[PDB]
C-alpha cells in the first residue's frame, strides 16, 4: 500500500513515499521544520495548515529530494505533497472527496497539479546570456 510520487520543480525532485500510518514528515532524511532558508518558512507549512487535521493524521509521507537549488527544493516539496494529496486520494477514498480537495488547493494555487515546465533558454552563440548580445562599434 504505497505510491512513490514525484513533484518535479525546475531542476528538483521530491519523491513522495505515500502510505497510511501515524503522520510523519521527512525531507531527504531530515525532519519537518528543519528547513535550510528561513524565508521559505510557511512555504513548506502551506499544505498542512491549509489541508486540515484528520487528513494529516492517518498518512505517512516521507520525502527524498535530489534537488537543484534551495527555493527549487521548497516549491518541489509543496508540489510533491499537493500532488501526493491528489495521488493518495486517487487510490483509496472515493472521488467525491478527491476531486473536491483538489478543488480546494487549485482555487488557492493552480500549479499544484499543473506542472508548468520552464527550463532556461539556451545560451545563444552571439551573446553572453540566453537572449542578450554585445556592444556594437559604430562610427
Amino acid at each position: 500500500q504505497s505510491v512513490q510520487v514525484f513533484g518535479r520543480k525546475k531542476t528538483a525532485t521530491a519523491v513522495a513515499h505515500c502510505k497510511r500510518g501515524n503522520g510523519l514528515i521527512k525531507v531527504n532524511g531530515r525532519p519537518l521544520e528543519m528547513i535550510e532558508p528561513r524565508t521559505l518558512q510557511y512555504k513548506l507549512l502551506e499544505p498542512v495548515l491549509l489541508l486540515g487535521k484528520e487528513r494529516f493524521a492517518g498518512v505517512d509521507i516521507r520525502v527524498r529530494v535530489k534537488g537543484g537549488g534551495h527555493v527549487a527544493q521548497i516549491y518541489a516539496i509543496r508540489q510533491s505533497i499537493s500532488k501526493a494529496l491528489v495521488a493518495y486520494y486517487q487510490k483509496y477514498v472515493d472521488e467525491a472527496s478527491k476531486k473536491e480537495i483538489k478543488d480546494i488547493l487549485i482555487q488557492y494555487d493552480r500549479t499544484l497539479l499543473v506542472a508548468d515546465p520552464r527550463r532556461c533558454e539556451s545560451k545563444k552563440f552571439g551573446g553572453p546570456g540566453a537572449r542578450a548580445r554585445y556592444q556594437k562599434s559604430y562610427r
Binding site: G29, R30, P31, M34
Partner: protein, 143 residues
C-alpha cells in the same frame, strides 16, 4: 525521546558540540596550526577563538555522512570563493594541513576507522557521542 541527530536545531547543536568538547580538552595541534591559522586563501585570522572546536564540529556531521571519504574529501567540503581583485573569482579547494589535523584529533579519541578502498568513517564510539549531545541540546532547545 526518540531523537535523531537531525531532529535538533542544526547550528546550535554543532555549536554546543564545541562547548562539551572543551569539557575534556580533545586536541592534537603540532606547531603551525597553533601559530597562524589561515583557511584556503582568505582575508584574516578567525575572529572566533575556538576554531579547533569549530573545525572539529563541522568535521563531525560531514563525516557522519560520508564514510570511506577522506582528507581530500573534507578539503572539498568546506570550500571558499577566493577573490582575485581585477581578475574574476575562481575556486580553490579547502586546506590540507588541518584537513588531516582535524581528522588526527578525532582519531586520537578513537573516532575513525579506515576503508582500504576509501578512508575515514565513524565508529560506534563517536556515533554514540553525537546522539547523546543531541539528547541534551534539543532537550535544551525545547526547554
Amino acid at each position: 525521546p526518540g531523537v535523531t541527530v537531525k531532529d535538533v536545531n542544526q547550528q546550535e547543536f554543532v555549536r554546543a558540540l564545541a562547548a562539551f568538547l572543551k569539557k575534556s580538552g580533545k586536541l592534537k595541534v603540532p606547531e603551525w596550526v597553533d601559530t597562524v591559522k589561515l583557511a584556503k586563501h582568505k582575508e584574516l585570522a578567525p575572529y572566533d577563538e575556538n576554531w579547533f572546536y569549530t573545525r572539529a564540529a563541522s568535521t563531525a556531521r560531514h563525516l557522519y555522512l560520508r564514510g570511506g571519504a577522506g582528507v581530500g574529501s573534507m578539503t572539498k567540503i568546506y570550500g571558499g570563493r577566493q577573490r582575485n581583485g581585477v581578475m574574476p573569482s575562481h575556486f580553490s579547494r579547502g586546506s590540507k594541513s588541518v584537513a588531516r589535523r582535524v581528522l588526527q584529533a578525532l582519531e586520537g579519541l578513537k573516532m575513525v576507522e579506515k576503508d582500504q578502498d576509501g578512508g575515514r568513517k565513524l565508529t560506534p564510539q563517536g556515533q554514540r557521542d553525537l546522539d547523546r549531545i543531541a539528547g541534551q541540546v534539543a532537550a535544551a532547545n525545547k526547554k
